[PDB]
């Protein structure tokens, strides 16, 4: 980026020197080298807008103070300039609290975004009944029910109108003495605001990648954490995104041990394994316990570039930088119980450092146990979607050659992924298969604009547990013992009788 413009503001001809500043590494557009952090900053510059962040300095300059600063720093430290960070500032919706003082008879009206609702009060009315009538009128009005939500506040004589579209301007007014208006807005966002930002801010055209809400997971309670986990699961499993989410434990004071983390993960559900749970908070160099997600994601993106995109965010070869310790020491037996339940532990190995020793999802499906398989499937799907985006809104002439061309494009993209190494198989015929020609397209659906493609893939797997079976041999008989045992083992594997038996502990 820099190092090239040094001689631009010099008119004289000649040779000068400029001591070489740092150069940025441009990050390419591979569908899965981005991380989206959903956080809050009182400085609402980019409310509900995923904004690219160049570095922690840019984050501080733009958003100023924020509880996500530590997570951003960890992400950049672990990613080392690779991968992109997109921050989403949660927008706090406007709120209007109306207190109905009494049941005075008369004609009054309630205004919301210029839409007036006439309210009539007769003898026998009550504050609660008037509030309920106002709420019902607003919620059953065809215009307001979409813009705002009306509910009961802390008193039956109170009505709370919350903007259903936080960015849009919401205004309210009253025509009546009994109705007392007050403007309000939570100075901090809530779980509902986080849910709206998660469900209504990501354009499928956005680069696929990881999604993290470390601030929300560290701050919110159990119910709100479950709600946000459900929101992330729905986002990532939505047929338009197919992303991956990194779930964190609550505050360590709440999740003190591994059993509590296991219970929380068990409460969490991810049928297809789009969400992966991690637990120990990563105490950074400034000694702050920072939710794992960001650090893990940074390492993941870095690993994707170096090791490979089929490689899961784990390993001792790819540790965690920017941290010094773990907020809790997970024992081997705790991890033995936890890992099969979907808890990915982070451990302080000696001679290696801080290492993620887990690569499992929250799915109960044995086929998507490992997050590497989930990421491979997401990469395939998102690559195909980005490729087809250019094929959307294309006329289908007489030849019907567009379907053939789509099959061609699918073959090319899947061959590229094969070369990338995402599939198990020595050949593409072993790796993947496509079917999208006109033989599967129905004219009735084509009239509506629907094209169906069918794809089969064989994702690569990983090494999780390595078993060493070595025999102690007497002096002299090693060659014969090895010959006999190897013959037996090879024969059993060849004829498929190796598995027949009972698994020991």
């Amino acid at each position: 980026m820099t190092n090239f413009l040094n001689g631009v503001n010099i008119g004289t001809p000649g040779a000068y020197a400029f001591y070489q500043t740092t150069q940025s590494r441009p990050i390419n557009v591979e569908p899965f080298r981005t991380c989206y952090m959903v956080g809050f900053a009182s400085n609402g510059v980019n409310k509900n807008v995923p904004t690219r962040i160049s570095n922690l300095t840019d984050f501080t300059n733009v958003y100023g103070t924020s509880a996500s600063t530590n997570s951003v720093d960890l992400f950049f430290k672990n990613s080392q300039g690779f991968g992109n960070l997109y921050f989403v500032n949660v927008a706090i919706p406007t709120r209007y609290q109306i207190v109905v003082t009494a049941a005075t008879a008369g004609s009054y009206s309630v205004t919301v975004n210029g839409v007036t609702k006439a309210i009539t009060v007769v003898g026998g009315a009550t504050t609660t009944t008037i509030a309920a009538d106002v709420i019902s009128a607003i919620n059953n009005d065809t215009v307001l029910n979409k813009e705002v939500l009306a509910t009961v506040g802390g008193t039956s004589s109170t009505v709370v109108i919350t903007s259903k579209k936080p960015t849009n301007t919401t205004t309210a007014a009253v025509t009546g003495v009994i109705f007392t208006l007050t403007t309000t807005t939570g100075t901090s966002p809530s779980v509902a605001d986080y849910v709206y930002t998660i469900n209504n801010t990501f354009d499928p055209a956005l680069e696929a990648g990881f999604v993290i809400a470390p601030e929300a997971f560290s701050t919110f309670t159990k119910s709100d954490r479950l709600s946000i986990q459900v929101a992330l699961e729905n986002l990532c499993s939505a047929y338009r995104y197919q992303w991956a989410a990194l779930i964190d434990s609550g505050a360590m004071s709440e999740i003190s041990n591994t059993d509590r983390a296991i219970a929380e993960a068990a409460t969490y559900n991810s049928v297809q394994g789009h969400c992966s749970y991690y637990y120990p908070y990563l105490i950074n160099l400034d000694d702050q316990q920072v939710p794992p997600s960001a650090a893990v994601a940074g390492m993941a993106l870095y690993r994707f570039v170096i090791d490979g995109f089929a490689e899961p965010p784990a390993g001792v070869n790819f540790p965690l930088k920017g941290v010094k310790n773990v907020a809790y020491k997970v024992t081997w037996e705790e991890q033995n119980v936890a890992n099969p339940e979907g808890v990915n532990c982070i451990l302080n190995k000696e001679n290696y450092g801080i290492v993620v020793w887990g690569a499992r999802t929250l799915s109960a499906d044995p086929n998507i146990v490992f997050i590497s398989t989930r990421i491979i499937l997401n990469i395939v799907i998102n690559t195909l979607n980005r490729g087809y985006d250019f094929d959307i809104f294309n006329s289908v002439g007489g030849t019907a050659t567009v379907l053939d061309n789509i099959q061609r494009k699918t073959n090319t993209l899947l061959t590229t992924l094969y070369q990338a190494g995402l599939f198990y198989g020595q050949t593409t015929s072993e790796a993947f298969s496509v079917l999208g020609d006109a033989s599967v397209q129905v004219p009735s659906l084509l009239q509506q604009g629907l094209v169906n493609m069918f794809i089969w893939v064989v994702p690569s797997t990983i090494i999780e547990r390595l078993i060493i079976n070595i025999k102690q041999t007497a002096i002299g008989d090693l060659e014969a013992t090895v010959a006999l045992d190897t013959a037996a083992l090879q024969s059993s594997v060849e004829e498929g009788t190796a598995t027949e038996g009972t698994a020991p502990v």
Binding site: Q407, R408, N411, G425, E430, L435
Partner: protein, 161 residues
């Protein structure tokens, strides 16, 4: 008694994928499609009979031809440049079908010659100012593998596993 008529020599549609671009053009002539085993000779010592040992598979060069028509400039400029990129390959799609006019009736997948390199590009077979034949664009490709997964027959499966 024949229940199903055999394929004619005109019973195949040929298409090309050159690098990261999909060509909309069709080819009217393609040469033989083969899997060749280079052979060695040996003996068991038990007899003077010569035995043949297969090895060193190769898929021989395939020559596609079509009528040189306008709109072929893009195809020329892509076939010339495909080899320049070591990442780029030429992929040939052959869909067998039963056609009367434009009423092709495909069945089964399509034979895919994958990882092919251009060895020859002949926009103009010849020029004869009083000739009458259609000018024939020609292209020679050196395929590296053959597969088929676009349909319901899969007539070129390898012994993979």
């Amino acid at each position: 008694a024949v229940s199903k008529r055999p394929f004619s020599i005109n019973s195949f549609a040929v298409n090309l994928n050159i690098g990261n671009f999909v060509d909309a053009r069709y080819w009217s002539k393609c040469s033989k499609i083969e899997k060749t085993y280079n052979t060695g000779e040996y003996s068991d010592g038990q007899s003077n009979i010569i035995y043949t040992l297969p090895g060193a598979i190769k898929y021989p060069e395939v020559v596609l031809s079509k009528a040189f028509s306008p709109g072929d400039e893009e195809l020329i400029n892509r076939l010339i440049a495909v080899n320049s990129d070591p990442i780029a390959w030429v992929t040939v799609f052959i869909q067998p079908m039963y056609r009367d006019g434009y009423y092709n009736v495909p069945q089964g997948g399509k034979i895919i010659l994958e990882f092919c390199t251009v060895a020859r590009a002949t926009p103009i077979n010849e020029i004869d100012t009083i000739g009458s034949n259609a000018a024939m664009f020609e292209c020679a490709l050196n395929p590296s593998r053959i597969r088929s997964d676009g349909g319901n027959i899969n007539w070129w499966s390898e012994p993979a596993a």
